Design an enzyme around this catalytic site. Sequence first.
Site, mmCIF file in Angstrom:
data_model
loop_
_atom_site.group_PDB
_atom_site.id
_atom_site.type_symbol
_atom_site.label_atom_id
_atom_site.label_comp_id
_atom_site.label_asym_id
_atom_site.label_seq_id
_atom_site.Cartn_x
_atom_site.Cartn_y
_atom_site.Cartn_z
ATOM 1 N N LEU A 22 0.911 -1.181 0.000
ATOM 2 C CA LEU A 22 0.000 0.000 0.000
ATOM 3 C C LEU A 22 0.934 1.211 0.000
ATOM 4 O O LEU A 22 1.844 1.031 0.815
ATOM 5 C CB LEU A 22 -0.796 -0.046 1.305
ATOM 6 C CG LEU A 22 -2.075 -0.874 1.440
ATOM 7 C CD1 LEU A 22 -2.723 -0.471 2.765
ATOM 8 C CD2 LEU A 22 -2.923 -0.580 0.206
ATOM 9 N N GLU A 30 -10.131 2.371 7.045
ATOM 10 C CA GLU A 30 -10.307 2.230 5.586
ATOM 11 C C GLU A 30 -10.419 0.719 5.346
ATOM 12 O O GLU A 30 -11.291 0.326 4.565
ATOM 13 C CB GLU A 30 -9.194 2.828 4.768
ATOM 14 C CG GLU A 30 -9.369 3.273 3.347
ATOM 15 C CD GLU A 30 -9.822 2.200 2.399
ATOM 16 O OE1 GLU A 30 -10.783 2.116 1.684
ATOM 17 O OE2 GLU A 30 -9.011 1.271 2.365
#
EC number: 1.5.1.3
Length: 186
Positions: A22, A30
């Site tokens: 990520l 999230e």
Amino acid sequence: VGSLNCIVAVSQNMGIGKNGDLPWPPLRNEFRYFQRMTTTSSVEGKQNLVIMGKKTWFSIPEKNRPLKGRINLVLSRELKEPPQGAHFLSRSLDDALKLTEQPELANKVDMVWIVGGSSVYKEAMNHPGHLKLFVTRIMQDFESDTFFPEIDLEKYKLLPEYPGVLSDVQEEKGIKYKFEVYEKND
Ligand SMILES: NC(=O)C1=CN([C@@H]2O[C@H](COP(=O)(O)OP(=O)(O)OC[C@H]3O[C@@H](n4cnc5c(N)ncnc54)[C@H](OP(=O)(O)O)[C@@H]3O)[C@@H](O)[C@H]2O)C=CC1
Ligand SMILES: COc1cc(N(C)Cc2cnc3nc(N)nc(N)c3c2C)cc(OC)c1OC
């Protein structure tokens, strides 16, 4: 089979990953939202099917593999069998979808969610028929090596709102982000 949907978190520069990771520090809420949105079935005794490429499957920590409560399908052309932990392997998006329509999963699947990567998003986004894009916009630039394709606003409309999706700016680790829903029908 119900709804065909795409879910993604993207940086302002459109980045969706970096070295199989990520581009941002982990954002617990999230991920909470990604889990809730993909797992939740709007029909009892049905499960959601999650479709991903090979790099996406290998990007989730092993402990979180397979995503629990969902049918996991990996899209690969080189793999002969599903990775360990996975449930189905398809050669393409179109084959993955036909399998749905088999008496196999036939009675089994509610909504189908595409969770990555680019090539997978890029083709779903061009698959004709109805589709919804669930975009988390991470409001800053992050060094990335893989991007989300361009959203054609002449085809996808941003929804002013959507049931169960917060409309206001979120903030975690002093990183600001917002939830967007786009719909297409062509
Ligand atoms: N921010 C977010 O929301 C997300 C971020 N990510 C991140 O993105 C990166 C993973 O991304 P990405 O590189 O795009 O790779 P993919 O996850 O989409 O994996 C690539 C491989 O998947 C198989 N494959 C992919 N598309 C297809 C297809 N349409 N038909 C058949 N097989 C297909 C192939 O395997 P083969 O060679 O084996 O045939 C292809 O090489 C990491 O950085 C990951 O953590 C990933 C998902 C969501
Ligand atoms: C680093 O830890 C994790 C990484 C992941 N990866 C990188 C996949 C991942 C993460 N966030 C998404 N957000 C959205 N909004 N959409 C996706 N398709 C996402 C995916 C596809 C997924 C995780 O659980 C699913 C996780 O638990 C810790």
